[PDB]
Amino acid sequence: PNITNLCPFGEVFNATRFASVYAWNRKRISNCVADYSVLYNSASFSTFKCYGVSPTKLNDLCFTNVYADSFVIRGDEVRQIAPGQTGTIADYNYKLPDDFTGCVIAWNSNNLDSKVGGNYNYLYRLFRKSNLKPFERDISTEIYQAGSTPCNGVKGFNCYFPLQSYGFQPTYGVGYQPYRVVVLSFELLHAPATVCGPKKS
Amino acid sequence: STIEEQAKTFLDKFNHEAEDLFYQSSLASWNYNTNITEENVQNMNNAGDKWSAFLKEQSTLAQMYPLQEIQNLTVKLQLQALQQNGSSVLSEDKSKRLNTILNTMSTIYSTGKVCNPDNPQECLLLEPGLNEIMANSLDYNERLWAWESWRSEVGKQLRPLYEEYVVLKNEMARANHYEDYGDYWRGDYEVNGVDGYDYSRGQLIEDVEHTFEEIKPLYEHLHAYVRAKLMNAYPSYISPIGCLPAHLLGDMWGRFWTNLYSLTVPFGQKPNIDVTDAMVDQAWDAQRIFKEAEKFFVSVGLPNMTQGFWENSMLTDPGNVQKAVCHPTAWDLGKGDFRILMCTKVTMDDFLTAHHEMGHIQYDMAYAAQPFLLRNGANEGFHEAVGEIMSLSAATPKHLKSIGLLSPDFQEDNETEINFLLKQALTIVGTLPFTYMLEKWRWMVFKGEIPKDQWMKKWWEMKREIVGVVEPVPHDETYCDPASLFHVSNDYSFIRYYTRTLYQFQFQEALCQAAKHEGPLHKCDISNSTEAGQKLFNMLRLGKSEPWTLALENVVGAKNMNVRPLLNYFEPLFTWLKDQNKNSFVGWSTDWSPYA
Ligand SMILES: *[C@@H]1O[C@H](CO)[C@@H](O)[C@H](O)[C@H]1NC(C)=O
Ligand SMILES: *[C@@H]1O[C@H](CO)[C@@H](O)[C@H](O)[C@H]1NC(C)=O
Ligand SMILES: *[C@@H]1O[C@H](CO)[C@@H](O)[C@H](O)[C@H]1NC(C)=O
Ligand SMILES: *[C@@H]1O[C@H](CO)[C@@H](O)[C@H](O)[C@H]1NC(C)=O
Ligand SMILES: *[C@@H]1O[C@H](CO)[C@@H](O)[C@H](O)[C@H]1NC(C)=O
Ligand SMILES: *[C@@H]1O[C@H](CO)[C@@H](O)[C@H](O)[C@H]1NC(C)=O
Ligand SMILES: *[C@@H]1O[C@H](CO)[C@@H](O)[C@H](O)[C@H]1NC(C)=O
């Protein structure tokens, strides 16, 4: 039939501000029509790597819910947003499961997320005692204890503040330039699937 | 938990903070160099102070992790680099005195202006005028006046300052568990803890002497030929049996002999390989010069320059309104930012300099992956050597014919090869005894082998014995003749040029053997050879992570610096010089036979 009520992809991709990787934003997308060909045929994206599904059949399948996680990371760290990877972003900031079905989309945001003095708003967690579980968020700002001595809440010798800032500057190289990453997670549950693709007439 | 894990997390924190602070400092320095304005000078100074303060704080934090409980070589290398006290071990009064002495020597050398007595209304600064009088004049007494007047004023000002400098630096070095300041400088080549690839601080002097003993016949023949030609240029001053007069070497100190090419040319009638007119005829912009250099580096298989490099670099002089430093410098700002600051003209020298500085940039890009404290050359010699090999390869007639800058019907006979090799010898071979003698004299001064009342008597004795250069008139101890040079007056190591010169030809033989070049070594071009670039990039990617001996094994297959590739490079010239010196006397006499 005639289709309306498209999914709110404007409020995820075209957002004025993106969250830091440590405190990555998750938006649950339900009860609308998701047109994935608009995203795939865009020339504005640098990474559109889909894991567990192909982009061509996305516009046909139907899912119960869509999770859109959004964060900013350095370009070199874009590789770490994948199943089975290792690094600071994957161990301590954002972990993807090995059995992940969804797409990882990234694009350079040097124009919007870099400042000449440096943009220090965006942060990452350098240290955590253990690696993150898949789809876990850690927003704790408790001092990391690398040594036997208690930190007691105040930085010092062998006790470091967990969150560090990428001071993005426009002059930086591609590896260190800010990249906005949207990860779409597709799951099917026994509830009626309502995020369906567009149907031709 | 363990000390090693604690150090690893400390280093991770340090690397993160260090990269940001280093970028801010580098960017501020770039802003000053590209734009000499008071605001920039302030910003640069502030960032430099912040960086130095950070490095003092982190060295103080770093020392609390003992070295002997860490087994990983990379972690121990970074901790060793960061746990150095530097001048911090010295007392605050003496540290302030040392810093004041260094600054005032910098001001005395930079702003030293000397002119002729009885005509004092306008004087000559060393960089614009004195250098020109040394490189272009053919008058004996004018060059003698310039040389003696600059060593009189600068040496008599700098001698008490240098006497304080040696004592303070020796005190700091012995406070840092070194024998002297010379041992501190020689510690750059020290490799400890690696089985087989260990290198000692004491081995450096022995290796330098062993290589120089093989340098000596070629230098003796070159010295005899230059002596005969200078005898032709100046009829009565130069003796057939004695040393060369000091003020006639074409430079202020005798550092290079490249300004004697006009006087000592073998075949003046034959043409040169100057390509300046050809680029002017084809309207080669500085952008085209750097693009051709980039084409050379992509031909050998190295990565091409980043978009950031093109956008953020200043490759042309900005203009009258904006002031900039004219010296060509490759800048590794950090965080993926690589830039070149050069006031590029349309000359062969600027084109070769573009290749040299882009080689510096390629080394920086290759070692960028490595941790911050390890982002450097394996030693001080390699970083300059990798630019000098590009300067060697680009200057070949095969490269010029390949890129179209030289006519395809240019005749490459033996005479042009001889005169080109002689020019390369005047630049390269002539600096080796001067470099070795200067470093050996400074090492003996720091070690206490030479007492303060015998500094100059020994120094000229060394120069006659090694360099074969005699003083025009005797100097007493009121003079400070070494410190008239930029590197010694401003606390810089000088053995890097000797090691760079040997590493240059070792790398050249390794890459030419990789590229399967079948002719003379000086006729070799490393373009179009992926394997040569791969062999180079294997060492380039390591940076300071691995010992310099292991890096040299990676390139040339030897565990030590070697002198045979240099001698192989100049072998046609060596045979020609031996043929030309049949009638004349090779070698010199240390007596006062020319003039004293
Ligand atoms: C986001 O912005 C781009 C560029 O302006 C635009 O083409 C696109 O339609 C916008 N919306 C989405 C969902 O990508
Ligand atoms: C150079 O300095 C002047 C004065 O501070 C400034 O207005 C100008 O924009 C600067 N140019 C560059 C390229 O930094
Ligand atoms: C040394 O530490 C680095 C991490 O900093 C690690 O990747 C490397 O494998 C370690 N080397 C050894 C020999 O354990
Ligand atoms: C640096 O100086 C401190 C204080 O004098 C000393 O305890 C420490 O051992 C020194 N470190 C080195 C590597 O010399
Ligand atoms: C460097 O080479 C790559 C691959 O050939 C190319 O895509 C890129 O555009 C080049 N860089 C520049 C600045 O042209
Ligand atoms: C160049 O080769 C010719 C022909 O063998 C020879 O006569 C001449 O002496 C050579 N010149 C030099 C400088 O080697
Ligand atoms: C290197 O490769 C380029 C690309 O074809 C070629 O134009 C050039 O002539 C080659 N160099 C030599 C010395 O043949």
User: A5 and A98 share a domain?
Assistant: yes
The number of CA neighbours under 13 Å toward the Cβ of B413 is: 6
Measure the CA angle with vertex B288, ends B285 and B294; round to 5°: 150
The contacts of residue B523 (CB under 8 Å, 6+ apart) are: B396, B397, B398, B417, B517
Ligand 7 atom with the shortest distance to the CA of B525 = 13
B433, two tokens: 């005894």
Which residues, 6 or more positions from A138, have their beta carbon under 8 angstroms from its beta carbon? A22, A92, A125, A128, A132
Q: Considering Cα of B305, then B307, then B313, then B318, what sign does the dihedral take?
A: positive
Q: Do residue A97 and residue A147 come from a single domain?
A: no
**Structure determined by:** cryo-EM
- Whether A53 and A86 map to the same domain: the answer is yes
Does A127 lie at the interface with B, CB-CB under 8 angstroms? yes
Cβ atoms of residues A179 and A78 within 8 Å: yes
In chain B, whose CA is at the least distance from the CA of A148?
A: B1
* Binding residue positions of B for Zn(2+): 356, 360, 384
Buried b or exposed e, range B260-276, using 16+ CB within 10 angstroms: beeebbbeeeeeebebb
**What is the distance, to the nearest Å, from the Cα of residue B279 to the centroid of all Cα atoms in its chain?**
28
Distances (CA, A) of B522 to A78, B218, B585: 46, 16, 28
For B321, other C-beta atoms within 10 Å of its C-beta total 5
Same domain? A83 vs A163? no
Tokens of B33: 């160099």
Q: How far is A175 from chain B (nearest CA, A)?
A: 7
Contact B336 A173 (CB under 8 A): yes
Distance CA A193, CA B27 (A): 54
A 85-114: CB under 8 A from B: none
Q: Are residues A14 and A101 in the same domain?
A: yes
**Helix/strand/coil (H, E, C) string of B431-456?**
HHHHHHHHHHHHHHHHHCCCCHHHHH
Whats the size of chain A, residue-wise?
201
Q: Is the CB of B575 under 6 A from ligand 6?
A: no
**Cβ under 8 Å to A: B residues 71-100:** none
Inspect the interface and report whether the beta carbons of A171 and B307 lie closer than 8 Å: no
Closest CA to A106 of A19, A25, A178: A178
What tokens does A173 get? 């190289």
Phi-psi region of A16 (alpha: psi -120 to 50; beta: other; left: phi over 0): alpha
Q: Closest chain A residue to B61 measured between Cα atoms?
A: A157
* Domain carrying residue A58: 1-117+170-201
Q: How far is CA B319 from CA A185, A195, B33, B330, in A?
A: 56, 62, 14, 21
Q: How far is the CA of B313 from the centre of ligand 7 (A)?
A: 28
- Residues A16, A95, single domain; the answer is yes
What distances in angstroms separate CA B68 from CA B10, B84, B485, one per listed residue? 17, 15, 41
Inter-residue contact B204 to B548 (CB < 8 Å)? no
d(CA B473, CA A97): 82
Instruction: Verify that A43 and A66 share a domain, yes or no.
Output: yes
Q: Which tokens hold the place of B313?
A: 């670099």
Cβ–Cβ under 8 Å, residues A159 and A143: yes
Are both A184 and A144 inside the same structural domain?
Answer: no
Residue type at B157 in one-letter notation: Q
Do A162 and A201 have their domain in common? Answer: no
Which residue in this structure is represented by tokens 């934003």? A25
Catalytic residues of B: 357, 487
Residue B304 CA, ligand 5 centroid: distance in Å: 7
3-state secondary structure A74-126: EHHHHHHCCCCCCCHHHHHHCCCCCCCCEEEEEEECHHHHCCCCCECCCEEEC
Q: Where are the alpha helices (DSSP H) in B242-347?
A: 276-282, 286-299, 307-312
Per 3-state DSSP, what percentage of chain A is helix, strand, and coil (rounded to 5)? 15, 30, 55
List, as one string, the DSSP characters of B407-426. -TT----HHHHHHHHHHHHH
B270 touches chain A (CB under 8 A): no
Domain count, chain A: 2
Nearest-CA residue for ligand 7 atom 2 is B528
Neighbours of B6 (CB within 10 A): 19
Judgement on whether residues A69 and A151 belong to the same structural domain of the protein: no
Quickly list DSSP for B507-525.
HHHHHHHHTT--S-GGG--
- Tell me, in Å, the resolution of the deposited structure: 2.8
Query: Residue B125: is it exposed, middle or buried by C-beta count within 10 angstroms (0-12/13-18/19+)?
Result: middle
Quick one: which of A123, A90, A119 has its CA closest to A104? A90
CATH of domain B276-413+496-572: 1.10.1370.40
Kindly state the helix (H) or strand (E) to which residue B113 belongs, with its residue range.
strand B113-114
How far, CA to CA in Å, does B271 sit from each of A37, B49, B274, B358, B432? 67, 53, 9, 29, 28
Whose alpha carbon is nearest atom 14 of ligand 4? B176
**Which of these, B425, B445, B421, lies nearest to B433 by C-alpha position?**
B425
Tell me how far the alpha carbon of residue B417 lies from the centroid of ligand 6, in angstroms.
11
Domain ranges of chain B: 3-84, 276-413+496-572
**DSSP assignment of B164-220:** HHHHHHHHHHHHTT-SSHHHHHHGGG-B-SSTTT-B-HHHHHHHHHHHHHHHHHHHH
Over its C-alpha atoms, chain A yields an Rg (Å, rounded) of 19
Which residue, chain included where needed, has tokens 């912009």?
Answer: B285
CA distances from B188 to B162, B266, B378, B450 (A): 23, 40, 9, 24
8 Å CB contact between B220 and B581: no
Closest CA to A32 of A64, A55, A54: A64
A81 and A139 co-located in one domain: no
How is B537-563 classified by DSSP, letter by letter? HHHHTTTTSS-HHHHHHHHTS-SS--S
- Decide whether any atom of ligand 6 lies within 6 Å of the B220 Cβ: no
Identify the residues whose C-beta falls under 6 Å from ligand 7: B 299, 398, 402, 527-528
Contact A147 B6 (CB under 8 A): yes
Helix, strand, coil tally for chain B in percent (to 5) = 65, 5, 35
CB < 8 Å to B312, chain A? 171
Of B463, B398, B558, B10, the C-alpha closest to B243 is B463
Same domain, A126 and A145: yes
